[PDB]
Scaffold this active site. Structure first.
Site, PDB file in Angstrom:
ATOM      1  N   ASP A  58       0.909  -1.025  -0.070  1.00  0.00           N
ATOM      2  CA  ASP A  58       0.196   0.120   0.068  1.00  0.00           C
ATOM      3  C   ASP A  58       0.994   1.197  -0.004  1.00  0.00           C
ATOM      4  O   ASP A  58       1.181   2.057   1.048  1.00  0.00           O
ATOM      5  CB  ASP A  58      -1.181  -0.033   1.262  1.00  0.00           C
ATOM      6  CG  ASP A  58      -1.928   1.166   1.135  1.00  0.00           C
ATOM      7  OD1 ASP A  58      -2.937   1.259   0.658  1.00  0.00           O
ATOM      8  OD2 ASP A  58      -1.477   2.222   2.047  1.00  0.00           O
ATOM      9  N   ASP A  69       0.626   3.887  -1.354  1.00  0.00           N
ATOM     10  CA  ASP A  69      -0.271   5.331  -0.985  1.00  0.00           C
ATOM     11  C   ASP A  69       0.483   6.047   0.060  1.00  0.00           C
ATOM     12  O   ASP A  69       1.154   5.779   0.716  1.00  0.00           O
ATOM     13  CB  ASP A  69      -1.712   5.085  -0.932  1.00  0.00           C
ATOM     14  CG  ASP A  69      -2.421   4.553  -1.968  1.00  0.00           C
ATOM     15  OD1 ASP A  69      -1.374   3.948  -2.612  1.00  0.00           O
ATOM     16  OD2 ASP A  69      -3.577   4.270  -2.132  1.00  0.00           O
ATOM     17  N   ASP A  94       1.622   1.999   4.683  1.00  0.00           N
ATOM     18  CA  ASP A  94       1.470   3.092   5.813  1.00  0.00           C
ATOM     19  C   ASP A  94       0.249   3.524   6.200  1.00  0.00           C
ATOM     20  O   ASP A  94      -0.921   3.627   5.151  1.00  0.00           O
ATOM     21  CB  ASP A  94       2.440   4.169   5.240  1.00  0.00           C
ATOM     22  CG  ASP A  94       2.046   4.526   3.707  1.00  0.00           C
ATOM     23  OD1 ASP A  94       1.250   3.746   3.095  1.00  0.00           O
ATOM     24  OD2 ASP A  94       2.972   5.217   3.212  1.00  0.00           O
TER      25      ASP A  94
END
Ligand SMILES: O=C(N/N=C/c1ccc(Sc2ccccn2)o1)c1cccc(F)c1
Length: 257
Positions: A10, A12, A221
């Site tokens: 992830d 992002d 995160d």
């Protein structure tokens, strides 16, 4: 597949959706110049769309937000479309066939130009970005360069593979992965876009693919996937700090993962 361990990323909030750049929060957190950071993020967001609009049919597929590239693989009358002029068609069962043509074309350009980006966007448009990368990595202390070490250490494993789960639309996410250099480590069939359905639907969409004989590990995160990875018995590996990556790579070098 026959892979034993699956690593869900992830990226992002750090790589894909680096919304800390444009907001200026990144410069406040890490003591950097705010104005320099915002300029670099705005130029990146432009080079991406200038690549996506001129090669991956963004303006056509902006609302047709699929979740996987092979999601509409059913409606494709598979035919050699090397002469198919996408600008001159009924695009604005017969539409899904035209829609699938573009996703197969998007995949073709992806699998062709992921280690040759100067061939897709001609040079110097690549030299301009390689300059843009170093200008940003000088602010993030080579975060993308550091994260690729962990990604290649997993891609090089025959029993392990790594997949990507972002919330951006699929085409911009493919454009970022293509430019940034993540194309070699993220196979296009292992990139999922949780735009409209949420990350839980994508996580459940993965386990049905890799089965119960695999060990799923989530690296990301934030906390949005914290419960999304807990409710599926996927261990969550936080990745906020820089030492969290050196330890992650350390834990990978010693076969602890
Ligand atoms: O580098 C990229 N992101 N990095 C993000 C991020 C957040 C936190 C940290 S760690 C750290 C350590 C010291 C000082 C600042 N940061 O990194 C990037 C992303 C996309 C494209 C690209 F080309 C590059």
């Amino acid at each position: 597949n026959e892979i034993e361990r699956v690593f869900v990323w992830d990226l992002d909030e750090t790589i894909i959706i680096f919304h800390s750049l444009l907001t200026g929060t990144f410069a406040s957190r890490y003591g950097k110049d705010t104005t320099t950071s915002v300029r670099i993020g705005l130029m990146m967001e432009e080079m991406i769309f200038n690549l996506a609009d001129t090669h991956l049919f963004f303006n056509d597929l902006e609302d047709c937000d699929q979740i996987h590239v092979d999601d509409v693989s059913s409606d494709d009358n598979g035919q050699d479309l090397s002469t198919y002029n996408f600008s001159a068609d009924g695009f604005h069962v017969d539409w899904m066939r035209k829609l699938a043509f573009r996703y197969r074309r998007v995949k073709e350009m992806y699998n062709t130009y992921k280690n040759n980006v100067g061939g897709l966007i001609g040079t110097p448009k690549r030299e301009t970005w390689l300059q843009l990368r170093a200008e940003l990595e000088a602010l993030t202390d080579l975060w993308l360069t550091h994260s690729l070490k962990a990604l290649n250490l997993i891609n090089s494993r025959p029993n392990c593979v790594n997949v990507l789960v972002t919330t951006t639309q699929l085409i911009p996410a493919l454009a970022k992965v293509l430019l940034y250099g993540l194309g070699s480590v993220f196979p296009i069939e292992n990139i999922y876009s949780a735009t409209k359905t949420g990350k839980e639907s994508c996580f459940e969409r993965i386990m049905q693919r890799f089965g119960r004989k695999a060990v799923y590990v989530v690296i990301g995160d934030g906390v949005e996937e914290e419960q999304g990875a807990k409710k599926h018995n996927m261990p969550f590996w936080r990745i906020s700090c820089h030492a969290d990556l050196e330890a992650l790579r350390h834990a990978l070098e010693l076969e602890y993962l």
